[PDB]
Design a protein around this ligand. Structure first.
Ligand code: HEM
Ligand SMILES: CC(C)=C[C@H](O)C/C(C)=C/CC/C(C)=C/Cc1c(C)[nH]c2ccccc2c1=O
Length: 401
């Protein structure tokens, strides 16, 4: 009973795994009575992410009404409060809408993320890996600019707007997570940036020669007469700008913390470079940037003797499931000839950007291990606030050639 009260943030934040452990041995599923259900075991986690009895129409759910009443506080700007009720082009939706949007978007997205763009991912990774030896904070000087540079290039942001995009990208990044520890002027400041980047994205799309890249390809995509509207194109641009920022930056920070804590596993990478991909999957497993994915039951349901009611919110603990996805799951091992993970979700909503995040993370680690013999981060680590995401706020790293 005192286990439930334990998720979250009484510096459950700083280390949640032993508590995730308690959950799996004792209380695999429970009503949070903050509001939602909480799910901790690999098998049910997979099961719920995959099932067509669970969806993501979050704006039309009672969940935020409930959360807000419980918190006694107004919702901060959040992806999927959508824009004006319409959370749809944010993929916080179910078939047949999600199906239509996913198909059109992923067709353009892949064409903008092929091995032709690889050189610029490497360039961004190596610059960042290089910045690490003369930075004060690896979060704001290295992890956060790397995905901003990459996405700017994927999207075809013109040279002149790079400064504008990077500023927007900064205000919007926290709109991925829920955080009720956000003053007013900052909600506003962040709201303006949702509005201004949607304004800008429309205009770039309707205005022919957007450079080669995603904005332009989102315009050209056509599946037998079917095609994205211009508000769909701009909302998708924003979704992609938010989706790929803090997930990627948190993971760069967490990767760093993890090789600091396990110097031998790093040694393995620098000495065995054929394991670079397996190591990335392992970081993402051991320290995922998102500890939860969310679902809404579309139907009264049974998931392992638990009784879920139409319209209940279900919090899927990706971070917990992962710790039992492989044998000895509490050991960080980059040599796992395996790497089963929930960090990208499963089923129809499987992270669309996951080949790109993997590419980014792999080039980053490859440059990292080729450039440096050791990395050490100063302990203890301060983590960003928020409900579902986990990664460091600041980071001091010592590095050696
Ligand atoms: C950095 C590592 C990343 C992780 C750990 C991550 C994780 C996620 C997770 C947990 C979801 C929810 C999946 C579910 O509900 O089952 C998601 C969805 C999504 N992600 Fe990411 N992501 C990452 C990087 C990216 C990047 C770089 C992009 C874009 C460039 C991206 C674009 C999206 C999109 C568009 C969706 C919605 C998919 C849908 O509903 O069909 N992801 N990803
Ligand atoms: C998934 C979801 C809507 C969860 C809850 O409603 C709110 C919550 C506590 C979120 C924390 C982080 C979060 C939104 C995680 C899953 C997820 C990620 C990582 N990226 C996305 C990108 C685009 C669209 C949806 C998601 C998503 O749901």
């Amino acid at each position: 009973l005192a286990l439930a009260v334990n998720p979250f943030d009484p510096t459950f934040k700083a280390d949640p795994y032993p508590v995730y452990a308690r959950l799996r041995t004792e209380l695999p599923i429970h009503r949070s009575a903050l509001g939602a259900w909480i799910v901790a075991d690999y098998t049910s986690c997979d099961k719920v992410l995959r099932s067509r009895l669970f969806g993501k129409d979050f704006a039309n759910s009672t969940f935020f009404d409930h959360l807000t009443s419980m918190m006694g506080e107004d919702m901060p700007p959040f992806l999927g409060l959508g824009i004006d009720g319409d959370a749809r082009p944010f993929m916080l939706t179910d078939p047949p809408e999600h199906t239509r949007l996913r198909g059109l978007v992923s067709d353009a997205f892949t064409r903008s993320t092929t091995t032709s763009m690889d050189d610029i991912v490497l360039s961004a990774a190596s610059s960042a890996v290089r910045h690490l030896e003369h930075c004060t904070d690896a979060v704001s000087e290295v992890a956060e600019p790397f995905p901003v540079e990459v996405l700017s290039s994927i999207l075809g942001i013109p040279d002149k707007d790079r400064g504008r995009f990077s500023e927007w990208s900064n205000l919007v990044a926290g709109v991925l997570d829920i955080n009720f520890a956000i003053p007013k002027e900052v909600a506003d400041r962040r709201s303006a940036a949702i509005e201004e980047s949607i304004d800008y994205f429309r205009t770039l799309a309707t205005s022919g020669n957007a450079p080669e890249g995603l904005v332009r390809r989102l315009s050209e995509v056509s599946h037998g007469g079917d095609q994205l509207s211009v508000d769909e194109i701009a909302a998708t641009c924003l979704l992609i700008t938010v989706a790929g920022q803090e997930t990627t930056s948190n993971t760069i920070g967490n990767m760093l913390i993890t090789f600091s804590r396990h110097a031998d596993q790093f040694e393995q990478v620098r000495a065995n470079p054929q394991f670079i991909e397996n190591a990335v999957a392992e970081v993402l497993r051991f320290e995922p940037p998102a500890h939860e994915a969310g679902r809404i039951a579309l139907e009264d349901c049974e998931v392992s003797g638990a009784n879920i009611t139409k319209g209940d919110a279900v919090m899927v603990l990706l971070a917990s499931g992962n710790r039992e996805a492989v044998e000895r799951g509490d050991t960080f091992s980059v040599t796992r000839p395996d790497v089963s993970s929930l960090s990208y979700g499963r089923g129809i909503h499987h992270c669309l950007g996951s080949a790109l995040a993997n590419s980014m993370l792999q080039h980053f680690l490859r440059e990292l291990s080729q450039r440096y013999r050791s990395i050490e981060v100063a302990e203890p680590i301060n983590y960003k606030p928020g409900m579902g995401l986990r990664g460091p706020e600041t980071l001091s790293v010592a590095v050696s050639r």
